[PDB]
């Protein structure tokens, strides 16, 4: 049984806005949003599933490491044949977020809200609304958002 050493410290701020930061006290944290506000569209070549999800990180600082973040963020989840929400990648030079994980399918919302009630603890579950829901994920710098 695989104990991966690329394990972040989670920092929930509230229902809706996370932070992982990175492994070894690094000086970034992914940042998750759940919001029912789309800011991506699909076009020919901005989609990933998944498994390839660390593409959405090609242009940053500390990719390899970003990788692994995300790999531990979702295990269970890429390993599920059903578990197929619709993702996009931004344009970060352009100011958009990494990843746009579309989570208006209610299995896919709900297995996404498990995993994060899981890794933070207690929170509103988001699934219960109806209309479009998205989990953003972006890279923010680690200012002590969390602490003792
Ligand atoms: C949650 O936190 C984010 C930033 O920390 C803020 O933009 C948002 O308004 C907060 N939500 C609530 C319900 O306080
Ligand atoms: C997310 O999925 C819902 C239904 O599956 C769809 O209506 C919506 O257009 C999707 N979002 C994007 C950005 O395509
Ligand atoms: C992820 O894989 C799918 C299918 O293999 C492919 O269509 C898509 O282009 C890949 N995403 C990225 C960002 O490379």
């Not at 800011?39 to 490491?65: G, H, M, W, Y």
């Not at 993702?87 to 399918?105: D, F, L, R, W, Y």
């Amino acid at each position: 049984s695989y104990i991966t050493p690329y394990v972040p410290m989670p920092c929930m701020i509230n229902d809706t806005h996370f932070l992982l930061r990175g492994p070894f006290e690094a000086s970034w944290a992914i940042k998750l949003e759940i919001t029912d506000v789309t800011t991506l569209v699909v076009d020919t070549d901005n989609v990933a599933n998944p498994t390839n999800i660390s593409k959405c990180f090609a242009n940053n600082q500390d990719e390899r490491l970003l990788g692994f973040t995300m790999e531990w963020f979702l295990s269970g989840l890429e390993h599920d044949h059903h578990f197929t929400p619709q993702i996009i990648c931004g344009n970060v030079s352009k100011g958009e977020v990494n990843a746009q994980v579309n989570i208006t399918m209610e299995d896919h919302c709900s297995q996404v809200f498990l995993k994060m009630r899981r890794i933070f603890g207690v929170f509103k579950n988001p699934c219960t609304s109806h209309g479009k829901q998205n989990v953003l994920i972006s890279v923010s710098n680690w200012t002590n958002q969390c602490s003792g």
